[PDB]
Structure 1
Amino acid sequence: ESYNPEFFLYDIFLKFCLKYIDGEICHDLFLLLGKYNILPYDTSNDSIYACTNIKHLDFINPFGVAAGFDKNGVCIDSILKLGFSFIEIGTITPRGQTGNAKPRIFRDVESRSIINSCGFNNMGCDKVTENLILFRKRQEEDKLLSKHIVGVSIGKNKDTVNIVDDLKYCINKIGRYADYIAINVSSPNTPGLRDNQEAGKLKNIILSVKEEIDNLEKNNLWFNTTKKKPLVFVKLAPDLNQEQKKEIADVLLETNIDGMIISNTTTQINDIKSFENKKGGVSGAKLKDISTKFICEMYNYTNKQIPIIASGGIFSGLDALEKIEAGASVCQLYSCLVFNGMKSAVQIKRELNHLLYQRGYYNLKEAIGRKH
């Protein structure tokens, strides 16, 4: 009963943390609990009707943890054992960074919103690779983790001129241990990063990343879950106009990107009194509708040819079903872990299974894109 993530004390501690403790400190405490493997766990098998896939990536269930939660890969086992099918570590950069000055994370509990200006704080590609190699060694000896997927989000150091150099550096160090690589061109907290979403720049970035991944073999294998070379995803920002979204879509089709993560934080949420005039991008429930509309738009601009990982405002099974019906094959959570806590995975999985049964869906795959 105690290791059950729905134990009552966890909600007691969650409420106390959300009322009296700084956001980053709460996060650091969660990571500390996982580092010592004293977090609750849920090793129950998941419904075979709720599993999903992106190409050859077979997700035991449709819920993972978004990037920026385990930036340095120091907590992969514990987070996954909460009930998640995958996690995206990072975003990492070649050299470590401490990020912007603190406090840089703020919460609004009433609206279930977060705002952050972290600035790609992380231990750097080389250290984080060592943490991921340790996990992959543990995974090779634990059967309960053999189907779990780990992706790596890569970006650039603040002072780097040509992003492709930094992306290549990361791919050549951590790529062989990744099940997929997420190209982060959508953080609002690294000056000029979002400009790389322009079509011509993005195209060259994607081809450069894919060419570097395809060269890992020759340069001398796959110490990951798929035992295959990592897929390539792009994470997009929701603060784009329609012509930019159409131009990106055309590039994603030409370059054969394996999927698109929709979406990162936004600067369009400005009705939160306590966040006014603050730096950073907003996450949480207020982002849900904005990011779901973005899924529908890109699902149609890419003619349904590009799989979608949903990110933004997902708290309930209904929220997740809305993303799936809009076009998503899998969902990523972040703010749900902040405001619901340890029970996030267990609870949302049960809710979705109930909804699939209620709505007359045979399985989750049948629901993908049904809104359209």
Structure 2
Amino acid sequence: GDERFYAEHLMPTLQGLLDPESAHRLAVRFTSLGLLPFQDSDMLEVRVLGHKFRNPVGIAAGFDKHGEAVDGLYKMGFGFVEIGSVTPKPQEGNPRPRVFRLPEDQAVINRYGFNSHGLSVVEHRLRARQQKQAKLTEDGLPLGVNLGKNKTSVDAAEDYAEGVRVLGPLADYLVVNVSSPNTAGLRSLQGKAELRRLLTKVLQERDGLRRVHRPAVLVKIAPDLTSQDKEDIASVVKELGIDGLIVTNTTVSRPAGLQGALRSETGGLSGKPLRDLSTQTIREMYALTQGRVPIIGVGGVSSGQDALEKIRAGASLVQLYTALTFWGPPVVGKVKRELEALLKEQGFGGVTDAIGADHRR
């Protein structure tokens, strides 16, 4: 496993031979079979959400939408895996092309639209390795399951409720994904009244599961929220005792300076141009929740510094996806190695010590 080789030769050649969706599909395939190219120190261990995480670097939702490559992803060095988004019924998503690379920006735009094998398929896939996962979790490698809703559903809350009932028993944590920019009307569920109603139902359904099968519940939010939106989300989270937040999904904004020819494609923008917008959203949400609500920080993480900035801003854990598509699997070890070195350099005894450090200076 060599960073230079992947960054300079393998990935650019892959990007030059296949379209983005094809590259994604082949990657899931390769990862699922364990055809892949760092020893986690105690400094990187985090205890949150009722679990030990051997390192704080996870794979973000969207890469493994259907739970096909979980074990290969742990082998890649991720401290936790999130699969999904999964919808109740199977659905195809948007017509192709629906994924676009912006190499000049180290960015991606996608409009997949919740292409999903559906709950039943994912349920059986996870059941086939349920005890293996139980041991992985105990060993500090938890599993998250990200829930979406069907395009033609009349009752959004019931979609998420069904997700809780079916995949909740198989997950260490669940994500109520109300932040995809690619499903019409979905982001409106972030509004105060809609969110409270939705999350009340979700939490009731979760509380009804047997104790060993009872996951933490997190809400994944957009980077495009107004100050009022963020205030309201913070209020509802505290009112209902939501276990955590995932911050953030992709942006519908197109920051000044984007160079990629494909910058004006419809969809969610990810990668470097999203990075600081996400970090600032983490920072705001941490403050609004008084540091009492665990945050998983996501968006434009490609290095140790990127990870630590989100951690200092208030994230207990981080995730990446887009960086993997540019630098390949070696980015995981790179992020962890750089993060460890930076923690030492900045006087932190571990990740835990650095969580929210910016707010205390």
- Range class of TM-score, shorter chain: over 0.9
SS of 1:315's equivalent in the other structure is: coil
**Corresponding residue number in structure 1 for 2:125:** 131
SS of 1:83's equivalent in the other structure is: coil
Asked if the contact 1:139/1:146 (under 8 Å) is kept, the reply is: no
What are the Cα deviations for residues 79-138 of structure 1, in whole angstroms up to 9, with x where unaligned?
A: 111101111101001101110000100011121000000000010000011111123244
285, 304, 307: which one pairs with 2:291?
304
73, 85, 97: which one pairs with 2:67?
73
Shift of 1:146: 4.0
Asked if the contact 2:51/2:140 (under 8 Å) is kept, the reply is: no
Shift of 1:144: 9.7
Shift of 1:174: 1.3
Spell out structure 1 runs of 4+ moving beyond 6 A. 142-145
What are the Cα deviations for residues 203-252 of structure 1, in whole angstroms up to 9, with x where unaligned?
A: 111111111011123xxx73xxxxx5100000000111111111111111
1:117 aligns with 2:111: yes
SS of 1:266's equivalent in the other structure is: coil
Residue correspondences, number: 357
SS of 2:343's equivalent in the other structure is: helix
Range with bigger deviation, 335-344 or 176-185: 335-344
What are the Cα deviations for residues 258-301 of structure 1, in whole angstroms up to 9, with x where unaligned?
A: 11000000011254352344210100000011111111111111
**Corresponding residue number in structure 1 for 2:189:** 196
SS of 2:100's equivalent in the other structure is: strand
**Corresponding residue number in structure 1 for 2:154:** 161
Change (3 A) 1:102 1:321: same
205, 224, 233: which one pairs with 1:212?
205
Q: Could you tell me which amino acid in structure 2 is paired with residue 64 of structure 1?
A: G
Shift of 1:160: 0.6
For 1:72 and 1:300, how far apart are their aligned partners in 2? 34
Q: Could you tell me which amino acid in structure 2 is paired with residue 203 of structure 1?
A: R
Matches within 5 A, 1:333-348: 333-348=320-335
Shift of 1:143: 6.5
SS of 2:105's equivalent in the other structure is: coil
Task: Please list every run of 5 or more consecutive structure 1 residues that lacks an aligned counterpart in the other structure.
Answer: 223-227
For 1:5 and 1:133, how far apart are their aligned partners in 2? 35
Percent identity, aligned pairs only, is: 40
For 2:298 and 2:263, how far apart are their aligned partners in 1? 24
**Corresponding residue number in structure 1 for 2:246:** 261
Range with bigger deviation, 241-250 or 271-280: 271-280
1:287 aligns with 2:284: no
**Corresponding residue number in structure 1 for 2:170:** 177
Change (3 A) 1:31 1:134: same
For 1:183 and 1:5, how far apart are their aligned partners in 2? 36
Asked if the contact 1:259/1:307 (under 8 Å) is kept, the reply is: yes
For 2:263 and 2:8, how far apart are their aligned partners in 1? 29
1:59 aligns with 2:53: yes
Task: Please list every run of 5 or more consecutive structure 2 residues that lacks an aligned counterpart in the other structure.
Answer: none
**Corresponding residue number in structure 2 for 1:82:** 76
25, 34, 39: which one pairs with 1:28?
25
**Corresponding residue number in structure 2 for 1:148:** 141
Q: Could you tell me which amino acid in structure 2 is paired with residue 213 of structure 1?
A: R
TM value normalised by structure 2: 0.94
Q: Could you tell me which amino acid in structure 1 is paired with residue 116 of structure 2?
A: N
Range with bigger deviation, 54-63 or 116-125: 54-63
For 1:249 and 1:341, how far apart are their aligned partners in 2? 35
For 1:241 and 1:166, how far apart are their aligned partners in 2? 26
Matches within 5 A, 1:241-256: 241-256=226-241
SS of 1:360's equivalent in the other structure is: coil
TM value normalised by structure 1: 0.92
